[PDB]
Ligand binder design. Sequence first.
Ligand SMILES: [Mn+2]
Ligand SMILES: [Mn+2]
Ligand SMILES: [Mn+2]
Ligand SMILES: [Mn+2]
Lengths: 95, 92, 94, 94
Amino acid sequence: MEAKTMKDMQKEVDAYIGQFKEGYFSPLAMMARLTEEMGELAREVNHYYGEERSIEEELGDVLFVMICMANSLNIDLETAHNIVMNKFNTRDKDR
Amino acid sequence: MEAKTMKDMQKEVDAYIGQFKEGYFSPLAMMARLTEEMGELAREVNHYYGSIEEELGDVLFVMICMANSLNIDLETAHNIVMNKFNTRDKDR
Amino acid sequence: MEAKTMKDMQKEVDAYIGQFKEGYFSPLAMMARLTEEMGELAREVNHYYGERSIEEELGDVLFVMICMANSLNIDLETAHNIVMNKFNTRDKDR
Amino acid sequence: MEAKTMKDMQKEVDAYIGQFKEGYFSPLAMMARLTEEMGELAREVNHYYGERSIEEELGDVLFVMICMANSLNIDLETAHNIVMNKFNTRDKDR
Ligand SMILES: [Mn+2]
Ligand SMILES: [Mn+2]
Ligand SMILES: [Mn+2]
Ligand SMILES: [Mn+2]
């Protein structure tokens, strides 16, 4: 493990977008971008599992737009992950 | 900041799924789950820009599930996308 | 009593949206709406295959499709026809 | 100049698919196909609104939907009607 934090991956994407005059796409434009990326993942999941490198890369593509979305709206995905994990966190002492 | 690495967040989800007899959804079923979560995100984005923090988390969870299912490390994924966007221009 | 045409189905949706001051969602907002409905379909496909509820969720996506098409003066009969043309091979045996 | 009914459009797709040994994709595979086409629609909506290419990509989405519907013996005219009934108001003035 190197190992990169979620905070750093977000900083890394923020640094890349920061160079452009355009900046982040508007949230609704982002949502279209995500739908587009998800389609490319769907295509690839269907190709390999329907009726590691390509499918690995299409996840990264989706993850990038997600980070963009999250950065655009000042959302920290580590926090986001934690609130989901807390929702699944059972009150059962045996687990 | 703690701060949590991508590998840790993936390990964390794998430990959660690992307790069930079922384990992971098959990839095509995952893809359906992912389409489902994306719609919930779309709803929230439209509502606020026509909750987001949580619905992004929800989509991220399914992503991690998908990646774990196929033994894919999302740090490597992120890196190979960053390499693609990385320009050979000395000025940038 | 007899089958409804795609043109009429579009006219029907246009008549319904026509009564509102706001009218059609902008194309990018429609796409968000369409993504939302697709998720509900996905949910229901997963539920039954991972009857009536799935029939309804297809209706929901079809409605937003029609809204999208109407919004951009696109006729879905014509759209469907270019797809059929794209697939209809020049093979005499088929 | 017909014009074409939804039932016929579905019959037309069923006849096209009916020639192949493989037949219809399973519902979960269909859903993946549909997610794929939606992305291509999204791409095209973003390009022009972030138009003839949108007409084609709407068609492609409509095709997979027809496939989906045929696959599960669902009539899309019926589906459309339940959605219209859902929005049908009990208001006498509308
Ligand atoms: Mn992708
Ligand atoms: Mn969600
Ligand atoms: Mn639906
Ligand atoms: Mn398309």
